[PDB]
Design a protein around this ligand. Structure first.
Ligand SMILES: Nc1ncnc2c1ncn2[C@@H]1O[C@H](COP(=O)(O)OP(=O)(O)OP(=O)(O)O)[C@@H](O)[C@H]1O
Ligand SMILES: Nc1ncnc2c1ncn2[C@@H]1O[C@H](COP(=O)(O)OP(=O)(O)O)[C@@H](O)[C@H]1O
Ligand SMILES: [Mg+2]
Ligand SMILES: [Mg+2]
Lengths: 70, 49, 52, 502, 468
């Protein structure tokens, strides 16, 4: 069916004329890609784009031992 | 690999014999065991970027 | 993990657009079907020839 | 995108005359097909919608066919085609590190598996000439298994017990523990593994691939998966397909291992599939040849001679039993195919012995006693010292006092019982096993308390891997524990016992 | 009007119907013309030469041969959406609350497939409930299936009325209840206890729970398909709205009991003790859709019945591979008075683990099973011989494991109306602390009548303070 071989490539080239993502999204693709974009961040964490690690650690304080001896 | 060795000091080190200060050494070796291998996995270097 | 998930949501929509549009394009034709029948005869004419 | 367009130009639209049988009925998976003259038995037939099926019964009027999939796209009056091949699955090393369904299509989504050779699921076990006896060991890393109930390479060993006792965990510490040989250097100490999931929900098999990928265990296994949602002819075909990827290894040189989890769910997929073909029921409505179902499976687990390649194929079938009764129909038919067993119980699991192995009953035809040379020294005496314990240590009510006579021997058991306990997903090595077992049988623990031996073990084990690495390398290399190697260990246990609790 | 058919044979609830052209595919719906109510037939088989065999959703009395039958074109569809909350439905999705129609924008078929492999979520947590037997020994998760096995008269629904009273109040998302084959006055006291307590709002759109009902008066083509109905209203609230939904099913055995009543008449040889040949493929197609996935999370709680108090029967004993937690109840426990009569030795989890439940909790867990097994392993000798022929160490796993059995019975909130005792909720951290003081041996002077039917551990010393 090479007449069908040409007819699924030629209506693939029409999909390669794109402006803003989906062609017939409407309220469908706008809600779904925003529902999924939250879920990759919801149970994952709150993370910005480029912020480095900012913290500070304190070690164990070295106490002394009192000892009258001999 | 910044890491220090030591001597074999487990036998009489709990026998420090303070004024009934048995807990002073019996807690001392207890900190000594966990801190040894845990700081060994710190001391050498960080992995590849 | 955001780069990969937006590729997956885009990939399935791109497939169904080519698929749901070809249903009406194959249905509308009326002259090329007569072209399609004579080659369907010639394939069957070719098919029985290699058997016997 | 360039990927969709290159997939559509590589597609081949070949057309030919089929051989074709009209459908007469479709209900509950069985499609009695009018027509189909020259069909074989066990041939794979292909429905119109993309489904696939296998023609089991031949008959003069109709042809019975069972479906690999779902029977709702199939209507009376459909078209059944002929492939021309008895049912075959792809095979190779290229399936390594994947999760696949029961016909070799990937359900992980990493893509198409590039496989080159195809092998039937109904091939024949090799006979009497091309085998040899069992020379090698297979290390599990469990300490109650490796010392007391050893398992050779090429020996069918049955893990049997109830639900939620340890049958899956026992066979997953075994998958993890071969990590140390697979990154080594010799090609004859490796062990490539295979897990077959029959009748399991996908929220257990997608969770076991997680446990097998943090420890990087998944780079040397395959997971053939037929979940509980699948068609009943897909849970029947799964162990015959998983066993046929095992025999790429064994028939080319290497050593494989295969776990059937479990084989009480490959039987109720045969009872249902062959009641709707109108075959008369036997006992408990099982068919006549459930013994022939399991026996033609568990005899491919060979150990070939060295003029064929010398490869091996171990097998570890799991069996779930009801209420711990071992005299049922499907248990006893598979006890008497396997060389040895591992009897997992429940009162061992709850009293505290975990892994809950009944070391009294866990018999094993020892596999030409390929335990290893050093473990024979310390677990030879352990086997007898534990057997001496079990005859005499079941009173729980004492009236008389014989500390010179009896209470010395039963103090050697509780030090060796509480030594045998283990954790989970942390399996040991064999020379780390010889060291910890040395300190138990040589009297070097009778002055402890039994509530401190599990604490004594990890402090001991961390001391020997850190400070004594060149010691343990002479046990693994030389095999045996030599007399000068007996000398060096005599101080280390006593030097550590001098400063253990302080 | 795709097709027209005439009834040919009628056996109970298995109506045969012959078409002339346009055979319906399997599991369509057929509409019987000439009745006062709606009668929908769902195609099951294809018996050869333009003849199907169907299973009917309502009663078949009054049908004659030749009576016309019309083809819908689609399976049983129900109206799904956010307006389904506070409404009661039946197997075909019609309002049986007499408050008028359900007006949604979309419709959902009853029959859909299962999720794939690569849409599973593995993340486990702990859902603290407030029951001591479940928090300590067998902790529930947040997103996993739970079963409550039990006979007849043990407590599988007083236990399910607690996990609503403790979890569905402090929940933030929605909720779905389903009744499959259990009695109808209990399905009326869930309407007049969720209206009074603000969960059903009759006047605006601030209601949380949905309801779906097919009870023990229906024909067995309805009980076999009512469980796939509440399972569909609890998937729109997962995949298309993205919430965290509960799901309470009672009872799920009647999906199977009423599937071996229409399997004899379809022409099938029976398997073991009387069940259908396909017992464990239809169960693995209903249970494989009740999942937590990457798009939402369903926290199932299913009550399961065991026939004639037998756990090796084929209908309960094939449900076990589909769970995460398990709460096997018992009869002989409940003859003593221990309520909730949970078997501490038969109940499991997959999150009881020292890295998940915390290594302090995991050692009070395994250490209290060890003392419980050792009381069971001497019941041969105590029953024949006596208590008085024991040692002194094993009169101290007997007296300590009778203080532990009694300290697993808790007064529930829903059971105040029975006995007149205040329902107690304990937190998690006050049970671990309260069992370490029975294992270490601090309360070995208090009697055993003081550990019984109390909440946190300070009531046990207070009940011991009363009797003197
Ligand atoms: N070595 C061990 N020590 C202590 N507990 C363990 C060990 N191995 C497994 N367990 C625990 O025992 C429980 C059951 O183990 P597992 O799931 O392997 O049993 P199973 O019989 O395979 O279950 P199923 O009956 O569902 O197949 C799990 O909760 C697991 O955490
Ligand atoms: N927690 C409890 N406290 C006291 N009595 C209970 C408790 N749970 C159940 N019961 C008793 O057991 C019976 C259980 O019946 P019910 O739970 O309604 O249905 P099922 O028969 O399915 O268990 C109740 O009527 C009640 O008398
Ligand atoms: Mg298992
Ligand atoms: Mg009830």
């Amino acid at each position: 069916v090479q007449k069908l071989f040409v007819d699924k490539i030629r209506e693939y080239r029409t999909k390669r004329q794109t402006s803003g993502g989906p062609v017939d999204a409407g309220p469908e693709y706008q809600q779904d890609l925003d529902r999924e974009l939250f879920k990759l961040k919801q149970m994952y964490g709150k993370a910005d784009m480029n912020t480095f690690p900012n913290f500070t650690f304190e070690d164990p304080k070295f106490e002394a031992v009192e000892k009258p001896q001999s | 690999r910044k890491l220090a060795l030591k001597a074999i000091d487990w036998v009489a080190f709990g026998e420090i014999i303070p004024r009934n200060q048995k807990a002073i050494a019996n807690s001392l070796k207890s900190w000594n065991e966990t801190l040894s291998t845990r700081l060994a996995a710190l001391p050498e270097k960080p992995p590849a970027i | 993990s955001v780069q990969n998930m937006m590729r997956q949501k885009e990939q399935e929509h791109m497939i169904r657009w080519v698929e749901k549009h070809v249903v009406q394009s194959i249905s509308a034709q009326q002259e090329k079907e007569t072209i399609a029948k004579c080659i369907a005869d010639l394939k069957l004419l070719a098919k029985k020839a290699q058997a016997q | 995108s360039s990927i969709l367009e290159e997939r559509i130009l590589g597609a081949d639209t070949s057309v030919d005359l089929e051989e074709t049988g009209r459908v007469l009925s479709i209900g509950d998976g069985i499609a009695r097909v009018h027509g189909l003259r020259n069909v074989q038995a066990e041939e794979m037939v292909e429905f119109s919608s993309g489904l696939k099926g296998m023609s089991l019964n031949l008959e003069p009027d109709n042809v019975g066919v069972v479906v690999f999939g779902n029977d709702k796209l199939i209507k009376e009056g459909d078209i059944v085609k002929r492939t021309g091949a008895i049912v075959d699955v792809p095979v190779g090393e290229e399936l390594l590190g994947r999760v696949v369904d029961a016909l070799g299509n990937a359900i992980d989504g990493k893509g198409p598996i590039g496989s080159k050779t195809r092998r039937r699921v109904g091939l024949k076990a090799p006979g009497i000439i091309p085998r040899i006896s069992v020379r090698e060991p297979m290390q599990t890393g469990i300490k109650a298994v490796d010392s007391l109930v050893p398992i050779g390479r090429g020996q069918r060993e049955l893990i049997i017990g109830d639900r939620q006792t340890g049958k899956t965990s026992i066979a997953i510490d075994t998958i993890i523990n071969q990590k140390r040989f697979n990154d080594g250097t010799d090609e004859k100490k490796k062990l490539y593994c295979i897990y077959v999931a029959i009748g399991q929900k996908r929220s257990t098999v997608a969770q076991l691939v997680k446990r097998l990928t943090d420890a990087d265990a998944m780079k040397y296994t395959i997971v053939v998966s037929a979940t509980a949602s699948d068609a009943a002819p897909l849970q029947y075909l799964a162990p015959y397909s998983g066993c046929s990827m095992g025999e790429y290894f064994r028939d080319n040189g290497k050593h494989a291992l295969i776990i059937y989890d479990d084989l009480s769910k490959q039987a109720v997929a045969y009872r249902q599939m062959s009641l709707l073909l109108r075959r008369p029921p036997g006992r408990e409505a099982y068919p006549g040849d459930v013994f022939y179902l399991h026996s033609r499976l568990l005899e491919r687990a060979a150990k070939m001679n060295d003029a064929f390649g010398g490869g091996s194929l171990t097998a570890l079938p799991v069996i779930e039993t009801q209420a711990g009764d071992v005299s049922a129909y499907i248990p006893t038919n598979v006890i008497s195919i396997t060389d040895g067993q591992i009897f997992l119980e429940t009162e061992l699991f709850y009293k505290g012995i975990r892994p809950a192995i009944n070391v009294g009953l866990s018999v094993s035809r020892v596999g030409s006693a390929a335990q290893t040379r050093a473990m024979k020294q310390v677990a030879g005496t352990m086997k007898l010292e534990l057997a001496q314990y079990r005859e005499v240590a079941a009173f729980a009510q004492f009236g008389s006092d014989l500390d010179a006579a009896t209470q010395q021997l039963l103090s050697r058991g509780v030090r060796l019982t509480e030594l045998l306990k283990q954790g989970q997903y942390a399996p040991m090595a064999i020379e780390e096993q010889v060291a910890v077992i040395y300190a138990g049988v040589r009297g070097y623990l009778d002055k402890l308390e039994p509530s401190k031996i599990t604490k004594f073990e990890n402090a001991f084990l961390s001391h020997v891997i850190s400070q004594h690495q060149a010691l343990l390398g002479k046990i693994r290399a030389d095999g045996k524990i030599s007399e000068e190697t007996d000398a060096k260990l005599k101080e280390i246990v006593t030097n550590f016992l001098a400063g253990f609790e302080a | 009007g795709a097709a027209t058919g005439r009834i040919v044979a009628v056996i109970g609830a298995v109506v045969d119907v012959q078409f002339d052209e346009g055979l319906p595919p399997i599991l369509n719906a057929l509409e019987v013309q000439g009745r006062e109510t709606r009668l929908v037939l769902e195609v099951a088989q294809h018996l050869g030469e333009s003849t199907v065999r169907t299973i009917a959703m309502d009663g078949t009395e009054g049908l004659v041969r030749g009576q016309k039958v019309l083809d819908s074109g689609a399976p049983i569809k129900i109206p799904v959406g956010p307006e389904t909350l506070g409404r009661i439905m039946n197997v075909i999705g019609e309002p049986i609350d007499e408050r008028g129609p359900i007006k949604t924008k979309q419709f959902a078929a009853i029959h859909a497939e299962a999720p794939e492999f690569m849409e599973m979520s593995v993340e486990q947590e702990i859902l603290v409930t407030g029951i001591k037997v479940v928090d300590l020994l067998a902790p529930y998760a947040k997103g996993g299936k739970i079963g409550l096995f039990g006979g007849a008269g043990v407590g599988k629904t007083v236990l399910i009325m607690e996990l609503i009273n403790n979890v569905a109040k402090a929940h933030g998302g929605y909720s779905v209840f389903a009744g499959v084959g259990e009695r109808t006055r209990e399905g009326n006291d869930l309407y007049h206890e969720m209206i009074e307590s603000g969960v059903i709002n009759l006047k605006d759109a601030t209601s949380k729970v949905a309801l779906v009902y097919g009870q023990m008066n229906e024909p067995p083509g309805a009980r076999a398909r009512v469980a796939l109905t509440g399972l569909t209203v609890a998937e729109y609230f997962r995949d298309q709205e993205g919430q965290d939904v509960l799901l309470f099913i009672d009872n799920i055995f009647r999906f199977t009991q009423a599937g071996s009543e229409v399997s004899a008449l379809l022409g099938r040889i029976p398997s073991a003790v009387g069940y259908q040949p396909t017992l464990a493929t239809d169960m693995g197609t209903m249970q494989e859709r009740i999942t937590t996935t990457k798009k939402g999370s369903i926290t199932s709680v299913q009550a399961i019945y065991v026939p004639a108090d037998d756990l090796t029967d084929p209908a309960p004993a094939t449900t076990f591979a589909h769970l995460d937690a398990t709460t096997v109840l018992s009869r002989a426990i409940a003859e003593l008075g221990i309520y909730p009569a949970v078997d501490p030795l038969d109940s499991t989890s997959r999150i009881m683990d020292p890295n998940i439940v915390g290594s302090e909790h995991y050692d009070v867990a395994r250490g209290v099973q060890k003392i419980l097994q050792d009381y069971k392993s001497l019941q041969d000798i105590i029953a024949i011989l006596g208590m008085d022929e024991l040692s002194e160490e094993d009169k101290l796993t007997v007296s300590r494991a009778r203080k532990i059995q009694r300290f697993l019975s808790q007064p529930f909130q829903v059971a105040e109306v029975f006995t007149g005792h205040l329902g107690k909720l304990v937190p998690l951290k006050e049970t671990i602390k309260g069992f370490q003081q029975i294992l270490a041996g601090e309360y070995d002077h208090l009697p055993e009548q003081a550990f019984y039917m109390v909440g946190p551990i300070e009531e046990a010393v207070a009940k011991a303070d009363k009797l003197a």
